[PDB]
Write a protein that binds this ligand. Structure first.
Ligand code: HEC
Length: 108
């Protein structure tokens, strides 16, 4: 496979128009529909301190890396059969990478 970085930029609005709808990547961030992913990159699937997640996402114990996160976002409901990621997903090629890199910019 090839992740490759690319150029966040669009990734910002993308997040703001895709993920942020349910999420945020902010420090004192709420948990609206989905939990804040502030530095998610580094932990495993089901950390937060409040959210408590689904048994699926938890028991998945999947690591969040630019690579793994990619497939997950490409199609999260398939990757985690039981997440409440009610999400469109990032089955593109560029938009996806722009987002992964954006997240890394927003909080590595
Ligand atoms: C609402 C319609 C959502 C959209 C759009 C996105 N996400 Fe989401 N996400 C949502 C929920 C309700 C949950 C919790 C389910 C669970 O138990 O995991 C999630 C979870 C995630 C996770 C996992 C959290 C963790 O393991 O700590 C990630 C990494 C995640 N979501 C990322 C993510 C991104 C980057 C999105 C835009 C591309 C996105 N989500 C959209 C709900 C919704």
């Amino acid at each position: 496979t090839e992740f490759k970085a690319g150029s966040a930029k669009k990734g910002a609005t993308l997040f703001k128009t895709r993920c942020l709808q349910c999420h945020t990547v902010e420090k004192g961030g709420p948990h609206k529909v989905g939990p804040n992913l502030h530095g998610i990159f580094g932990r495993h699937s089901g950390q937060a301190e409040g959210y408590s997640y689904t048994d699926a996402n938890i028991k998945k114990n999947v690591l969040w890396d630019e690579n793994n996160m990619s497939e997950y976002l490409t199609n999260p409901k398939k990757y985690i059969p039981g997440t409440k990621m009610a999400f469109g997903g990032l089955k593109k090629e560029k938009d996806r990478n722009d987002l992964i890199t954006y997240l890394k910019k927003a909080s590595e």
